[model samples]
Target: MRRTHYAGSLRETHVGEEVVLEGWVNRRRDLGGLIFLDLRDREGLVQLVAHPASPAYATAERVRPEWVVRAKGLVRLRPEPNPRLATGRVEVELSALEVLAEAKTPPFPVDAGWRGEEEKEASEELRLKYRYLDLRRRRMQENLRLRHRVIKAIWDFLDREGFVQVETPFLTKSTPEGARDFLVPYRHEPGLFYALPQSPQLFKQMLMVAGLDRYFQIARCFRDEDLRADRQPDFTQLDLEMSFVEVEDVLELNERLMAHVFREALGVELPLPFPRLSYEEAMERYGSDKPDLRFGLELKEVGPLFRQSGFRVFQEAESVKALALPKALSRKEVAELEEVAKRHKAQGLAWARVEEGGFSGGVAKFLEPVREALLQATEARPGDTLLFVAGPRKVAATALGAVRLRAADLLGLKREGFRFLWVVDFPLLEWDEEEEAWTYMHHPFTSPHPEDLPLLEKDPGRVRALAYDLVLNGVEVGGGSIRIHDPRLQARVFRLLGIGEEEQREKFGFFLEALEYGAPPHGGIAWGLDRLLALMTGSPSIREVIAFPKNKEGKDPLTGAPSPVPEEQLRELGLMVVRP
Candidate 1:
């Protein structure tokens, strides 16, 4: 349908202008034989009225909610203004109206406000099944519109920054790395298959080798992993790779890109250079590589004070950490916090409130001898409570860190601002207890930190890499590393990761060969575009930003995807289902 103006965009300035508008009926009312309707377009909603004598009157009277209609009208100032809308002062007096499509009553109220009464909450199954209709709601429309603006902003900003947007192969060879690959069966190759590119990681790096100084992709990655409530089978990431750069160069360009994206998409000018924290400092102080620094619940080390403590949990632990929750909670809240702690592998959460009588709570008596020292260390006020977790050093820190966040949420700590930080100098490798071997923490291709190169052979676990993660409000939004360009160094990192030379040659033969071909000192970062948008939109999960998100079980309610395939289709793929 040809439309001269958006119904939702009409304003006083458009008064007396004859226009055409196409939209769905958002709401309708009839009074004194005059029909008034709220017409909704992608922009928003605006009012349209049809006089009884007008040619559009008969059609307007029969227009139902969600009916797709086109109207020809003259814009005029509203007799009574609606203060809630941007185009509130204007109304369209429809002279002609035609229904393009009639819709059944939506399974749920499309006009119902987001997040209101219990009755207003539609079952997620129904919402997802009728996603096209669900997305017609104001909130969903706004979310998708925001997503569009964000993606466009990214494209514009990166294009201006001399970054070349490249499309990489979706069907590529599978390589062992982070997550399990979603393998596509190949009929032509019998049992052989192609794997969806996880991040365009290798291709982007090769682009740098091919002299594309700066390359990027709005990449779609797939993983054969659990659909873990918040995760999806396929996700989007803004991938980038650049040549002849170190960690500083990568961080500088990326942070500025983030600032630009925020400014254009959210109208918030994020301050440049974002705060920096070393991985060690982030963990030791905040107990997370990506930490929420918006509050003052910094974990305090009380291990020294508990060297010979009476509390068996603390006394026998390798380390003890305590979070000074500014306020205490009720017994129920305390129980929840304790449960959360245990979920994180802590034996139990111990607390000692700094009461007028000095100390009181679960572990007050056990920690009495160290109470004075603990209070001083925690900087606790008379009413503040210190939540304690004791175990191995890392466990103690992380478990208590989780409790700190939970306590903040329960106490409404008001962590209400974007706090961006670069967590740098991460260890290149970590000892994987599950695998019982050293694993690359930032991938094997990561360059060792200049100062820690010597420590690679001496103590791989202690060697730091030129890797960094961008954390916003306690969530890791993106990460990057200055890649190891030298084949020897790459091989060393690979060997340290327990990849035998033969296995390395088989798995990363092409990548290792590319490294030998004078690959420049290149590095890159990938932003979790979904996660970033979720944070920007103030959504609880990335699913909120994604338009067609799969359910927790990885099923697409709209299409009933991931269903069993026909035997003919299976035979074509040289595959068949084998269920236990």
Candidate 2:
């Protein structure tokens, strides 16, 4: 008989009638001469009971966990009911059962906590290896569901806004901006290769010039970059560009769309008109362009307070900063907070666990000399953990920010609320010490503020970009910029990045040429869909929200890929992997 009904949803009405239930064998046990089996489908588990005298008994005895099974049964109300599952009021009273397919035992138990740093120790290598099995876990199943809902909501929102969904080429030319490209060997071209798109930025921009006024894509983009919590080699982005649209127009429409998505997809109604923070304010207050607003602690520069301190560490340090966590840490807790700072490469972390008794720790000794400034910089009080770090500005800020995140996590501070902020006017260029020149903070396409044009030639490091970051709960969920539509301005920006005229023509001559043909002041933003999904689902890693994520080592455990294709195939592509 064909399998008519799913195992999960059968209820009381079908009692004494023959029914077919097909699903994986969730569990099997013998209780008092009867066989109890939990049949599993995508929704959840349903128990099926069979008598020892039944015709399918022999087949049932050998059925194991994860084995696919089909059974002829009667749906009957259970003597005792389970209220937890959707259809727990009844069971499938089995008559005949067939084990359709068998599964080998999984390498690891798909059990316990959501896959995190603590669970299963899924190193970059191992997770990539067993990705298929990893995806089978319940948490991953939920994440996949969340991803579907989010993508659908985006489509729904954009479709309503007259934004046409467009698919750009995956096999496209590599651009000399952003991340390095992941090239694909083209069989038709033989000698030539197609680099997967880093973003549909150029194509989407061209579409704007083509008068496709409103365009958006749930675009799949690839990049060859080092992996982190939010970074992936292959990722998806909600890329959109508009013609004749200003920054506020784009921001208002997209923010409203996102607000609606959160409500529909996750039942979250986010505050509208996401809070805006200037780049300078964000860096000074949060020490991060994307600040998580759920927590209390924010970065305060203490450089001025220690400018004349007798202690050499604070006096000579490039910058000193503090984040005050109210009642979050004591003297002993303060020491552990220091260890957290060390993880981010801070040489040392100092703290003042303040109370009515005045202060404590390294900063306490110098309290007399710099008392007024310390109070001004820290705004310290009793029952507050004033964590301090003295190092180069970059190091100190980064370490303090990390510790701030940790403290929030530890203290269980405001875990579930949508705190959105739009950080604008990021630095156009940063001084790269190793490269000994200025580098684009976002990319060369980002426009410098019109007034900051002179600063590019004088103090390039201080010039601000016409850039914006969409921050949600301290994570930079999305970022983009107003593009430098002027060819002259684009060339000057490249020159500031130390790209000489000859090299500029070689790398981006076509892009600059496109700008000359009336490039209509276009700009766009791309969000990490996986990271967004992770945040929505409360999963720590984007891998949990990704259906078939690669391992940390960048290998696919499911397919054993990064595996050799074939010798002839490589030769056809005019390439070979050389042996070490």
CA lDDT of each prediction against the hidden true structure: 0.83, 0.78
Where does model 1 exceed 4 Å of error?
113-121, 176-178, 305-318, 361-374, 434-437, 563-566, 572-580
- Candidate 2 segments whose C-alpha is farther than 4 A from its true place: 11-18, 52-62, 103-133, 175-178, 185-191, 226-231, 301-322, 328-353, 360-379, 385-399, 406-416, 432-437, 451-461, 492-501, 565-580
Across 58-175, the per-residue lDDT of candidate 1 in tens digits comes to 8888889989999998898988897878888999898899999999998888764422223364888888888888877777777888889988988998899899999999889987
Whole-model lDDT, model 1: 0.83
C-alpha TM-score for every candidate: 0.92, 0.84
Native-to-model Cα distance after best TM-score fit, residue 368 in candidate 2, in Å: 5.2
Can you write out model 2's per-residue Cα lDDT over 152-187, one digit (the tens) per residue?
988988999899988999898766666788887887
Question: What would the TM-score be for candidate 2 when compared with the true structure?
Answer: 0.84
